[PDB]
Amino acid sequence: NVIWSQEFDGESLDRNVWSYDVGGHGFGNGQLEFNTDRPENAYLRDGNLVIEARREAYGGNAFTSARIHTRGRFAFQYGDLEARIKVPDTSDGIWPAFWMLGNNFPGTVWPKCGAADILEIGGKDGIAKGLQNRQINCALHFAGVGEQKTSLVEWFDAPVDLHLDYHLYKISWTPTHMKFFLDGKEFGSWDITASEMKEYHQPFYPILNVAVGSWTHSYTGLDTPEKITATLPARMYVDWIRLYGHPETKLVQN
Ligand SMILES: OC[C@H]1O[C@@H](O[C@@H]2[C@@H](O)[C@H](O[C@@H]3[C@@H](O)[C@@H](O)O[C@H](CO)[C@H]3O)O[C@H](CO)[C@H]2O)[C@H](O)[C@@H](O)[C@@H]1O
Ligand SMILES: [Ca+2]
Numbered sequence: 001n002v003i004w005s006q007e008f009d010g011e012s013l014d015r016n017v018w019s020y021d022v023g024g025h026g027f028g029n030g031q032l033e034f035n036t037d038r039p040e041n042a043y044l045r046d047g048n049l050v051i052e053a054r055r056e057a058y059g060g061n062a063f064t065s066a067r068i069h070t071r072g073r074f075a076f077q078y079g080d081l082e083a084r085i086k087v088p089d090t091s092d093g094i095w096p097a098f099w100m101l102g103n104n105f106p107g108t109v110w111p112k113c114g115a116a117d118i119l120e121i122g123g124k125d126g127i128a129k130g131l132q133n134r135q136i137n138c139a140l141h142f143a144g145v146g147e148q149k150t151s152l153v154e155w156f157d158a159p160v161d162l163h164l165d166y167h168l169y170k171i172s173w174t175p176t177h178m179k180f181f182l183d184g185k186e187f188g189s190w191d192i193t194a195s196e197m198k199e200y201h202q203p204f205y206p207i208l209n210v211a212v213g214s215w216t217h218s219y220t221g222l223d224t225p226e227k228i229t230a231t232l233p234a235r236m237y238v239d240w241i242r243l244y245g246h247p248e249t250k251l252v253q254n
């Protein structure tokens with residue numbers, strides 16, 4: 001039961017659904033890309049959203065890309081959210097993501113708003129183990145015991161190079177759990193009924209982006225433009241993002 005979706009048919013991103021996060025300030029992770037609202041970095045063609053990261057002098061940064069979300073226009077509580085994505089070769093340094101923030105962000109600061117990572121790929125452990133494009137993770141980031149930043153992370157080595165074709169990345173979110181899937185197959189699961197996880201019982205909205213680099217202590221391990229070796233331009237193709245409703249789903253659309 002699809003109750004919401006973006007099929008990305010047109011020739012332009014629907015600005016009544018999406019907003020762009022613009023800046024080159026690193027986004028809390030020492031990222032190197034300047035995320036822009038330009039057609040060069042985010043565009044539709046042939047039935048896909050394309051987010052394209054480029055090696056390019058722009059606003060004091062050495063790369064451009066995009067980071068888009070549906071804050072203020074779409075949010076939901078409970079359901080299955082799935083996207084059909086063909087990630088780029090993360091080689092070394094590209095960091096695609098599909099993820100969700102609580103709908104009270106940014107008024108409620110991270111991580112008190114709650115966060116769920118559906119797909120993250122391009123991590124330093126992958127790079128060290130020669131599993132670039134196979135090793136992914138899902139995650140929860142929230143205010144845990146003591147209200148202190150807490151992260152729960154599940155790693156999965158996919159059987160195939162995920163940049164070679166489209167795959168389905170899904171969260172299944174109920175009043176008791178959040179579960180994460182690749183091509184229908186569960187690879188992560190957390191109970192969310194504990195007192196410290198009430199932030200997961202409010203509406204959330206999705207975000208899609210392709211970051212380049214991070215601090216050495218952050219996701220990619222690669223903190224300078226000269227350390228990025230990935231094939232650029234790097235294109236993440238998103239054929240569609242769909243919400244499958246549950247009985248308890250609350251859909252929020254202004
Ligand atoms: O501002 C409060 C606090 O924010 C911290 O920065 C975080 C980023 O670490 C965070 O990274 C996301 C990951 O947690 C994960 O969800 O995956 C996505 C996609 O890859 C990441 O972007 O994103 C949040 C929201 O933008 C930031 O607030 C700073 O590190 C910290 O110093 C600061 O105190
Ligand atoms: Ca909490």
Ligand SMILES: [Ca+2]
Pocket residue numbers: 007008009047048238239240
């Ligand atoms: Ca499509």
